[PDB]
Ligand SMILES: N#Cc1c(N2CCCC2)n[nH]c1N
Ligand SMILES: [Cl-]
């Protein structure tokens with residue numbers, strides 16, 4: 001998957017696609033996604049993540065697809081990458097908590113939701129995180 | 137290769153220990169071969185990734201190290217040691233605001249008190 005590609009690239013380690021074209025491909029990926037063409041969107045986000053894995057917008061798009069497809073471990077892993085890339089957005093941490101609950105890891109999920117409540121300034125996200133904590 | 141148990145668990149432990157032996161002895165080229173071997177065998181092993189990232193950081197391949205540290209952080213979820221080392225790499229890449237954000241994240245989230253002491257010492261040096 002995207003992560004193994006990133007690691008292989010680093011084991012083995014040119015502006016082949018301009019920024020404007022990458023922007024266009026990202027918009028096409030969401031066109032597919034928004035129409036329910038999840039498989040085509042997944043290919044396009046995987047393509048983007050092969051070219052530029054360390055891009056928070058590409059990673060978040062792919063992580064969303066895996067969460068929808070109930071591939072919760074892959075989703076949680078990518079959301080954690082997204083947080084490392086975007087340290088001030090707790091949305092990926094919230095979604096990681098959801099994934100951990102589905103993975104039968106409620107203590108990991110609780111820690112995710114607690115991080116949101118302590119550190120996020122998104123008041124609506126904090127309510128959602130608290131609703132999960134109340135159920136745990 | 138890990139998924140198919142191509143090498144027994146005890147032998148992999150030995151290879152990891154030998155990799156760290158080379159590392160501790162300054163035999164960086166040999167350690168790099170061994171940590172690359174480990175990461176081919178199991179790309180999802182956070183300690184194998186961290187070992188290769190450490191070698192790249194020693195060799196001043198700071199962007200390559202930072203890239204691997206981001207993966208290592210994601211796979212480990214709650215260990216901020218890779219984030220601390222990413223902060224060091226960002227300082228060497230002349231990106232002090234990125235480094236500051238890394239060290240601050242360690243302070244805000246980590247429960248590793250010795251690691252937070254180190255992160256704060258870096259924050260204290262950053263202008
Ligand atoms: N899963 C998980 C997790 C966590 N985060 C922080 C960054 C994303 C995952 N912190 N503590 C945990 N148990
Ligand atoms: Cl993968």
Ligand SMILES: [Cl-]
Pocket residue numbers: 230231232233234235
């Ligand atoms: Cl900077």
Ligand SMILES: [Mg+2]
Pocket residue numbers: 117118119120121
């Ligand atoms: Mg607050």
